[PDB]
Amino acid sequence: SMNPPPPETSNPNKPKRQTNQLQYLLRVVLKTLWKHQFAWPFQQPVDAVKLNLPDYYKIIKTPMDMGTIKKRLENNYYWNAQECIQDFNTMFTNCYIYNKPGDDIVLMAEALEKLFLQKINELPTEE
């Protein structure tokens, strides 16, 4: 069994910026979710080999996780807040697509997503 390579976190070809919205995504959004009791399954790529989920990357063709998002924010990968918000939504959607209502992982994702929605509702206007 084999995991795919992780998503890209560095790419000198990619355009990027620092902005106040991206700062908020790191300081407020990511750090709020990261510290939550239910964060840990989402803090790194799904290890389908050790978890014995051999169909994971058959179903999930755009993997995403908060470890990747953390690296992207720390490494100034993004051009805008949309790109980062999309990564969070990909992560949640993957979980919902792969699993079933009521699964522990789905309940965990929902708790994180609740907080995500609350924080992104107060994303500041661009400076």
Ligand X SMILES: COc1cc(OC)c2c(=O)[nH]c(-c3cc(C)c(OCCN4CCCC4)c(C)c3)nc2c1
Residues that bind ligand X (CB under 6 A): 41-42, 46, 51, 53, 95, 98-99, 103, 105
Indicate the residue among 51 and 117 with the shorter CB distance to ligand X.
51
Indicate the residue among 73 and 95 with the shorter CB distance to ligand X.
95
Question: Cβ 126 to ligand X, closest distance in Å?
Answer: 31
Indicate the residue among 64 and 84 with the shorter CB distance to ligand X.
64
Task: Please give the Cα distance from 29 to 50 (Å, whole number).
Answer: 29
- What does the block give as tokens for 14? 């990619």
Question: Cβ 5 to ligand X, closest distance in Å?
Answer: 17
Task: State how far Cα 92 lies from the chain centre.
Answer: 7
Q: At what angle do helices 66-74 and 81-98 cross, to 10 degrees?
A: 170
Query: How is residue 36 annotated by DSSP?
Result: S
